[PDB]
């Protein structure tokens, strides 16, 4: 029950889901500053289904967990995702994020998919903004299912079933 | 006719209301009702005797909100230093 | 009572979490509660080389990046007794003064951003585009750089640097006034600031306050007037000061400042 | 006329009393009173309505008594709160307006109009008068209720909205009724009066003053100018007098005592109505107001807030002559001649006798040699015991109102034919 | 007197409205999966939002509340007057103005003490 | 206020790095800036103020 | 109506049905305008893919807001949820079919409103009691004194300012010497459009129906990149939608009114357009506080509560008294016309210095 | 008209039921709302148009929020012990209820009037006039009297 198993819906419906995609961003980093860059001011973003680009998962599901985090920060964010609806999807943005850059150390957080599950990897700290809509374009076809992995293998239309839901 | 009937009625549920009612302020909400009553009342004669029970009315209304407002206030000053929540809760004058 | 605010929230985007004593419908005293990140940059950088470090410098400052990157170039520098070239000094102030500018674009970008009327953050930003396309061409990096090395800057400026930064000299002048021009008027503009952001200047040196604070205070003191590091000593420009701690000053402050900056550039 | 005076002053004041200092308003306040005091005795005899405002004599008096209870209370006032002065302005107008009309939506809204402001007055912040406070007014506003659905019912009987209409059978025999209980609960009627002791008992002694002098003679004034079935008005009386007087040898306070008192003294009013001779009702609470007005200033002086029988004795020797003031209110309070109580008690029976009603005559006899236990209770008191605890001796302002007050009493004691004359509607 | 057409059609009007309004409740709602708020405790900013250390609010608010009832029994007033208004004459406009007089005289009482904050 | 206090042990990397942040000691007036504020008030009194977190965090 | 058609409960029905869906249609596109608008205005690119002009991204976003969860969350009752924002959204979509299109019975000959009434002014303000009634249950229904409390605040300035809007309402009343709609039209019909008869109670008026849920006096708090609306944050897909909706449903209709009292809608006496004479007034003002709305800031309701009741509403009956006296002895309404029109050029001529 | 007219006079009594009873103090509070707009309907059904709109402005409109928000400024209630819960007292509510009706009743079974006083219905409109003239006292009372009411209410809350 969320618009699928007739040919007709579940593309009309994924079309709906693809093309309204309201980014939620999780900054802490510098990533906030070239994301507020990110939206405007040479580029939209509203072309893409966003006037939501603030904080309420009362407003998204689309997560982007954007900079380098901590600790004290994994429970906190798990909860926040949490707090999101059932369809969701996650958005690890940047290097800072993704792997932990270059910081080895208790306090970090490395690998930031070990405190919430991932779909979408964009490398780059600093990204471009330009990557990140590449990215988005990306995770547009992805949840539209006309999507692999480098090794032709099919995946899910979402992030929120690689770990439990809710 | 049926009306004015009902408007008694209306009454005296309202009478019911204010008895049962525990805590003070549903009370003051059941009296409330009852003064619509005595309106409703009224009205109907109001179509007999010509209307002067429309001005009537609205005199009512506005003395009815007036005594709402103040007993509210009251309640107010009461419970801004309480935790209580009936009438009754409150009683030392008895003897 | 005693409200929670938390990390990351609406569009403030400190760690904050804060916790308000209030009298429910003022604030009475904060007890802020921070140190939700931190990273150990300190621990980290004896554990990598000098060359290393200078990753981590600009690592640690979204806004003025080289600034840090400076601070600690020189620090080394000075150990080592290393000197630098004339010219290098000269971009190097160049660089400085261009991330001194972009970072009061992004304060007053957020200023209105968080609160006050949204749209001029975005004019704001279309300079800092430019500023941004700056640092671009000569660096390479939009912002994080490494042009900066030790004993001057690690390579020639591009040709192309000339041109497209007298242009946006010419721009600027008119572009901040407008900015301005929002502010000092709208006398609702007044009625949110003013009143607000007092401390006593006695209080801001006790409990510690920088400059464009201190100075946000008018209490002159810029250290690059006090303890006067390179080409500074040789290049003319004033002090731009408030006269009291409130936001109204602070912001006002700013503009001078980056008028001030501008001239420098000129100069240089 | 007097009441554009009051009206005028009133509102005036409300935005003066601002800049004002508090001193200053309690000059202003006073002048005021007085200056339509004045002009109501100085209007004497001139029959004036404007519309469902309609002036006689009743009126007159009535509003006559009003004033002077509000200005003896008004002397007493010494806590900076200007309020309390304010407030009782307003309404004292509220009643004036009460009196003067027989347009029943009027009448209801200065019902509300009188009431509302006392509530207020009856906070110094002191927790049982709040208590109290509460109760009232949720009852008050039950009463208020039916006195708005007997009003209905009377534009139901007939589509009169003012008395003097012409009457009929059963809903009208109903509706007078539902006019009955309000005003009965205002007069302190039973079995509606019951509030009234608690309330004293938690409320400052000044309060007290107002309300025992104002409203009973208000809810009277509108009452008389109603038309009321004897057999009911018996009733009502019997239970309010026997209750009354049987609750009284209870106490142990003085207040909640004299509230019982004037349950008694309601009845006794009440017996007026079936000729509703004015002049003797008139009569009546001139006398009942004037001795107990006095009874509270004194008791103020004591302590403005509740006070056991034992505070009352050895009176003579803390001060001689305010016991004896004293002493005579409550013989004219017994009824007792050569005070006006005996002629307060004579005429309201001679309007009895007229009626020939004699059950009820003959109950009241009774209760009233009853009431006389507690006041020798006090008034004897006074004269025996050496000991006092800490009083205080108030103003000359009070002291020689309070023994003015007990020459007139014993003075209209000894010349009824005075006030009699121009009570025909003053004059 | 009014015709009784469009007092029918307010019935009309609002069943219409009340339909659409409960046929778009119930497709929002039959529609998504639905899991169990396991991980729910708030919704709204984590570190947790206040509420149980209130229970006492400002009186302000109050003040506000009551202002408002009395100044919309003014207007109520108002409209008769303000229908028949000429025609009524100087008496009218006096006793009119007297009425209004009296409640701008109630806003100065409150303002100048200003015990709303 | 900006400043490294850097101790070199004269290895291939510091012995100590200090950083001198100085919104970080900016911060420490903050219940002091926001005594007795309003409550719409209090969230610009911290903006105005200018927060880099990194400096708090470091 | 004394003199004006009628038609079958069939055709009423009918009118109704439309009129409610168009307004769903006029809402969405209005999304589009609002966000492309914005983006120029601001110097910008929009919505011009799935379009072309983004036309479909409305349907995606629809779409988006059902297939979801939509619970309600423990601490707070359930029938309380969903009543909370219906209320709202029933009582904005109602009121609209009393104001017309045109004129009389030129809707291809049939009646160009879905009611009409006699009463007009009445029931817009009592339409306007009815929104803030769901806001501050929405507050409550919650269970956060969080949410709570904004909603006190909120619901309290909006009824504050819901009473100035009473006291404009009875000026007009006086001049044509009635209240329903099409009468008030016709008599700018003759004289001519009444904002020229009292400027500054259009004025007041205009400035009065800002005071409306419309996102502009653009702080309440509201919701969307401040501290929010508690009407918000503590909902979900379609229902968040719906309130979103609701406020801009507000914004149109209070755009709607302001022609209609002091234009005439399609009155217009050097042509007759009917439909288009509507929408060139609504665009006027919409467009006019949406600019406001950009270039013009969030409002401490602190100041506001001083700003309103202390100076505002307080001149806008005075101004009301005056025009009464001169009502009331009935005199030369040019009287009123000369005065009310130097009263706009006093407080023009007080703007520049 | 009666089955219909009947059903109306039913809910209003209905919604009178449910505000009796429940203890659910913002369902009790709504449903009076529920019960004005009815008695409202009522009102205009008997040609009482005006005094529709007053009730609904004013009595619902106005009034029943200024509840809700002391309910809410002092949190809400549900605990059903007094310190007595008269439970006892029930049904004895119950029979004075029947009596103060059924008294009515009586005197009604035998009222008769029409109701043709019939003129144009509630309406300002030929109301005004009266009201001012006739009812002017009334009216000077009435704008006395909520005057009167605002500066008690103010003293009673703050200190001041
Ligand atoms: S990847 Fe780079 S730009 Fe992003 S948070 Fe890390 S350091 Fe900052």
């Known amino acids: 029950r969320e618009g699928i198993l007739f040919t007709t819906l579940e593309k009309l419906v994924a079309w709906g889901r693809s093309n309204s995609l309201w980014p939620a961003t999780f900054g802490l980093a510098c990533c906030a500053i070239e994301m507020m860059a990110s939206t405007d001011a040479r580029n939209d973003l509203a072309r893409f289904g966003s006037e939501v680009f603030r904080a309420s998962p009362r407003q998204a599901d689309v997560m982007i967990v954007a900079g380098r985090l901590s600790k004290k920060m994994a429970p906190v964010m798990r909860r926040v995702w949490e707090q999101m609806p059932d369809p969701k999807w996650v958005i690890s943005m940047g290097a800072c994020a993704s792997s932990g850059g270059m910081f080895n150390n208790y306090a970090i957080v490395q690998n930031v998919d070990s405190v919430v599950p991932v779909d979408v990897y964009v490398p780059g700290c600093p990204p471009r903004p330009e990557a990140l809509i590449y990215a988005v374009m990306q995770l547009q076809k992805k949840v539209r299912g006309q999507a692999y992995n480098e090794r032709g293998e099919r995946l899910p239309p979402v992030a929120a079933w690689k770990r439990t839901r809710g | ?95 | 009572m005693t409200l929670n605010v938390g990390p990351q929230h609406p569009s403030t985007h400190g760690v904050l979490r804060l916790m308000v004593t209030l009298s429910g419908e003022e604030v009475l005293e904060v007890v802020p509660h921070i140190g939700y990140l931190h990273t150990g940059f300190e621990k980290t950088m004896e554990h990598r080389t000098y060359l290393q470090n200078i990753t981590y410098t600009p690592r640690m400052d979204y806004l003025h990046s080289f600034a840090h990157d400076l601070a600690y170039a020189l620090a080394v520098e000075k150990l080592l007794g290393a000197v630098v070239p004339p010219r290098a000094e000269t971009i190097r102030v160049i660089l400085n003064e261009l991330s001194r500018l972009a970072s009061h674009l992004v304060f007053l970008g957020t200023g209105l951003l968080d609160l006050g009327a949204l749209t001029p953050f975005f004019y704001a930003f279309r300079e800092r585009e430019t500023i941004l396309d700056l640092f671009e061409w000569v660096t390479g990096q939009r912002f994080h750089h490494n042009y900066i090395r030790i004993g001057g800057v690690k390579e020639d400026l591009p040709e192309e640097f000339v041109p497209e930064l007298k242009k946006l000299l010419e721009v600027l002048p008119h572009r901040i006034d407008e900015y301005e021009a929002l502010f000092a008027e709208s006398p609702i503009f007044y009625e949110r600031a003013r009143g607000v952001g007092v401390i006593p200047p006695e209080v801001a040196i006790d409990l510690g306050l920088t400059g464009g604070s201190l100075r946000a205070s008018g209490v002159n003191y810029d250290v690059r007037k006090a303890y006067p590091y390179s080409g500074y000593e040789t290049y003319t420009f004033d002090v731009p000061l408030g006269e009291r701690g409130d936001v109204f000053d602070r912001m006002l402050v700013r503009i001078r400042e980056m008028r001030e900056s501008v001239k420098i550039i000129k100069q240089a | ?427 | 007197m009014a015709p009784i057409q469009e007092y029918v059609g307010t019935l009309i009007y609002v069943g219409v409205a009340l339909f659409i309004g409960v046929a778009a409740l119930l497709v929002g709602a039959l529609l998504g999966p639905k899991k169990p708020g396991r991980a729910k405790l708030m919704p709204y900013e984590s570190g947790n939002d206040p509420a149980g250390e209130v229970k006492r609010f400002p009186v302000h608010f109050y003040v506000v509340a009551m202002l408002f009832i009395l100044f919309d029994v003014e207007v109520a007033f108002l409209w008769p007057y303000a229908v028949s208004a000429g025609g009524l004459g100087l008496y009218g406009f006096l006793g009119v103005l007297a009425f209004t007089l009296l409640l701008f005289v109630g806003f100065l009482y409150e303002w100048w003490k200003g015990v709303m904050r | 206020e900006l400043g490294y206090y850097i101790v070199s042990d004269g290895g291939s990397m510091p012995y100590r790095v200090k950083v001198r942040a100085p919104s970080f000691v900016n911060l420490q007036s903050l219940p002091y800036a926001c005594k007795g504020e309003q409550v719409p008030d209090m969230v610009a009194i911290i903006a105005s103020l200018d927060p880099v977190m990194g400096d708090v965090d470091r | ?353 | 008209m009666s089955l219909l007219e009947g059903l109306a006079l039913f809910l209003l009594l209905l919604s009178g039921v449910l505000v009796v009873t429940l203890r659910n103090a913002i369902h009790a509070a709504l449903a009076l709302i529920l019960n004005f707009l009815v008695l409202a309907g009522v009102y205009v059904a008997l040609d009482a148009r005006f005094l529709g709109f007053i009730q609904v402005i004013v009595y619902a409109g106005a009034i029943v929020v200024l509840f809700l928000f002391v309910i809410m400024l002092l949190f809400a209630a549900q605990g059903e012990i007094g310190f007595d819960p008269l439970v006892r007292s029930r049904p004895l509510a119950a029979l004075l209820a029947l009596g103060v009706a059924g008294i009515l009743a009586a005197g009604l079974w035998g009222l008769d009037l029409a109701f043709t006083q019939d003129l144009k219905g509630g309406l300002p409109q030929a109301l005004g006039p009266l009201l001012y003239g006739d009812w002017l006292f009334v009216l000077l009372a009435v704008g006395f009297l909520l005057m009167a009411a605002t500066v008690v209410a103010v003293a009673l809350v703050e200190p001041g």
Do not use: C
């Open chain 7, 1 to 353: 109506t004394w003199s004006y058609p009628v038609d079958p409960y069939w055709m009423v029905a009918l009118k109704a049905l439309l009129v409610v869906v168009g307004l769903l249609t006029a809402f969405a596109f209005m999304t589009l305008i609002e966000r492309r608008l914005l983006a120029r205005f601001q110097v910008r690119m929009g919505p011009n893919r799935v379009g072309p002009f983004g036309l479909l991204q409305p349907l995606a976003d629809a779409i988006k807001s059902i297939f979801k969860e939509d619970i309600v969350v423990a601490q707070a009752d359930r029938f309380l949820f969903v009543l909370a924002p219906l209320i709202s959204v029933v009582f904005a979509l109602l009121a609209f079919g009393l104001i017309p299109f045109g004129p009389p019975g030129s809707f291809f000959g049939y009646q160009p409103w879905v009611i009409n009434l006699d009463l007009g002014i009445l029931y817009l303000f009592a339409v306007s009691e009815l929104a803030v009634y769901g806001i501050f249950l929405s507050g409550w229904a919650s269970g956060s004194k969080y949410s709570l409390l904004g909603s006190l605040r909120s619901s309290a300035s909006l009824i504050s300012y819901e009473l100035g809007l009473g006291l404009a309402l009875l000026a007009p009343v006086l001049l044509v010497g009635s209240l329903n709609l099409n009468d008030i039209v016709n008599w700018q019909k003759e004289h001519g459009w009444l904002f020229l008869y009292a400027f500054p109670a259009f004025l007041v008026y205009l400035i009065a129906s800002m005071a409306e849920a419309a996102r502009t006096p653009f702080d309440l708090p509201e919701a969307e990149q401040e501290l929010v609306g508690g009407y918000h944050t503590e909902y979900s897909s379609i229902k968040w939608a719906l309130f979103q909706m609701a406020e801009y449903i507000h914004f149109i209709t209070a755009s709607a009114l302001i022609p209609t009292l002091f234009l005439g809608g399609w009155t217009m006496p050097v042509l007759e357009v009917p439909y288009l004479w509507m929408f060139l007034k609504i665009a006027f003002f919409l467009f006019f506080f949406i600019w406001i709305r950009a270039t013009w800031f969030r409002l401490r309701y602190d100041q506001l509560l001083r700003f309103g009741w202390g100076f505002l509403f307080p001149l806008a009956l005075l101004w009301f008294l005056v025009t009464a006296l001169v009502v009331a002895l009935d005199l030369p309404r040019t009287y009123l016309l000369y005065l009310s029109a130097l009263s706009f050029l006093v407080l023009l001529g007080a703007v520049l210095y």
């Open chain 2, 1 to 95: 006719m049926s009306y004015l009937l009902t408007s008694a009625l209306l009454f005296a549920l309202g009478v019911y209301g204010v008895l049962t009612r525990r805590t003070a302020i549903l009370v003051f909400l059941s009296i409330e009702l009852m003064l619509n009553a005595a309106n409703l009342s009224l009205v109907g004669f109001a179509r007999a005797y010509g209307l002067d029970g429309q001005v009537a009315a609205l005199m009512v209304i506005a003395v009815a909100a007036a005594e709402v407002a103040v007993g509210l206030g009251l309640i107010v000053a009461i419970f801004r230093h309480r935790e209580s929540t009936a009438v009754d809760d409150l009683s030392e004058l008895r003897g």
């Open chain 4, 1 to 427: 006329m007097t009441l554009a005076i009051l009206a005028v002053f009133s509102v005036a004041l409300t935005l003066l009393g601002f800049v004002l200092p508090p001193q200053g308003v309690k000059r202003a306040t006073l002048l005021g009173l007085a200056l339509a005091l004045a002009s109501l005795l100085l209007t004497w005899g001139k029959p004036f309505a404007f519309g469902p405002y309609a002036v006689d004599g009743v009126s007159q008096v009535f509003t006559l008594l009003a004033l002077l209870g509000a200005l003896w209370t008004v002397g007493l006032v010494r806590s900076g709160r200007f309020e309390f002065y304010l407030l009782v302005l307003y309404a004292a107008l509220g009643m004036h307006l009460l009196a003067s009309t027989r347009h029943l939506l009027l009448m209801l809204v200065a019902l509300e109009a009188l009431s509302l402001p006392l509530y207020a007055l009856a906070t110094w912040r002191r927790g049982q008068g709040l208590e109290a406070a509460l109760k009232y007014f949720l009852l008050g506003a039950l009463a208020a209720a039916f006195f708005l659905y007997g009003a209905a019912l009377f534009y139901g009987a007939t589509g009169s909205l003012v008395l003097g209409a012409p009457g009929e059978g059963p809903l009208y025999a109903l509706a007078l009724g539902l006019l009955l209980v309000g005003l009965g609960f205002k007069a302190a009627l039973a079995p509606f009066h019951f509030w009234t002791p608690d309330v004293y008992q938690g409320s400052p002694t000044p309060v007290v003053l107002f309300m025992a002098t104002s409203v009973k003679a208000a809810a009277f004034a509108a009452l008389l100018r109603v038309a009321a079935p004897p057999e009911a008005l018996a009733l009502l009386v019997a239970l309010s007098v026997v209750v009354g007087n049987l609750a009284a040898l209870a106490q142990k306070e003085a207040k909640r005592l004299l509230a019982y008192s004037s349950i008694a003294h309601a009845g006794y009013m009440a017996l007026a109505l079936y000729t509703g001779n004015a002049q003797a009702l008139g009569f009546y609470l001139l006398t009942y107001v004037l001795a107990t007005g006095l009874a509270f200033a004194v008791l103020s002086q004591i302590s403005p807030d509740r006070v056991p029988l034992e505070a009352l004795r050895g009176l003579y020797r803390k001060d001689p002559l305010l016991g004896l003031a004293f002493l005579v209110a409550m013989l004219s309070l017994l009824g007792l001649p050569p005070l006006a109580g005996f002629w307060g008690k004579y005429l309201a029976f001679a309007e009895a006798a007229r009626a020939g009603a004699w059950g009820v005559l003959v109950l009241a006899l009774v209760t009233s040699a009853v009431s006389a236990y507690y006041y020798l209770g006090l008034g004897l008191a006074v004269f025996a015991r050496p000991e006092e605890t800490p009083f205080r001796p108030g103003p000359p302002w009070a002291r020689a109102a309070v023994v003015a007050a007990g020459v007139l009493l014993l003075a209209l004691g000894l010349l009824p034919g005075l006030v009699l004359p121009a009570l025909a509607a003053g004059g």
